[PDB]
Amino acid sequence: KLPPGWEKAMSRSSGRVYYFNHITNASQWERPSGEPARVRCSHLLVKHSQSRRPSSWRQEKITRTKEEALELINGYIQKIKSGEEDFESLASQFSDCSSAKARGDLGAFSRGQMQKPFEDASFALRTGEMSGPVFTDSGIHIILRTE
């Protein structure tokens, strides 16, 4: 039926079916379309006080809660999806990763290099697709598979 990872769901607010991916946390209205040695991704990281290192170039002391970080992530996803903001712009301005300076680009990587939830989401994304919020010990990620 659907590229494994995807399941059907129903909108609580509208009653229309949609599709959700439990590896990427992506959700979308259309039935999804459907692995390489390597993928290339960008990401926007929002850290929180329980992050493995609760500090970043934006903030010496990251004090926001996990819930607050998820609200920020969800806000960025909305603006990216509406076209109000570009992923690259929000990553440059607001990612707590040093990769912010490169518009979030991490370059290419294989399995075994990144944190597992990040890796699994990255490899389950199709080229050009964006994840939903992805949780790791670093914080919460929006992941964009570029290659």
Ligand X SMILES: CC(=O)Nc1cccnc1
User: Is 101:5 a contact under the CB 8 Å cutoff?
Assistant: no
Q: Least CB distance from residue 114 to ligand X, whole Å?
A: 10
Q: Which stretch binds ligand X (CB under 6 A): 28-36, 91-99, 108-116, 138-146?
A: 91-99
Judge whether 138 counts as a catalytic residue.
yes
User: Is 103:80 a contact under the CB 8 Å cutoff?
Assistant: no
Q: Least CB distance from residue 68 to ligand X, whole Å?
A: 23
φ/ψ of 12, rounded to 5, equals: -65, -35
| Beta bridge partners of residue 68, listed in sequence order | none
> Does the CA dihedral 77-79-80-81 come out positive or negative?
positive
> Per CB under 6 A, does 93 bind ligand X?
no
- Active-site hit among 27, 28, 92, 115: 115
Nearer Cβ to ligand X (80/106)? 106
Chain positions contacting ligand X, by CB under 6 A: 97-99, 101-102, 106
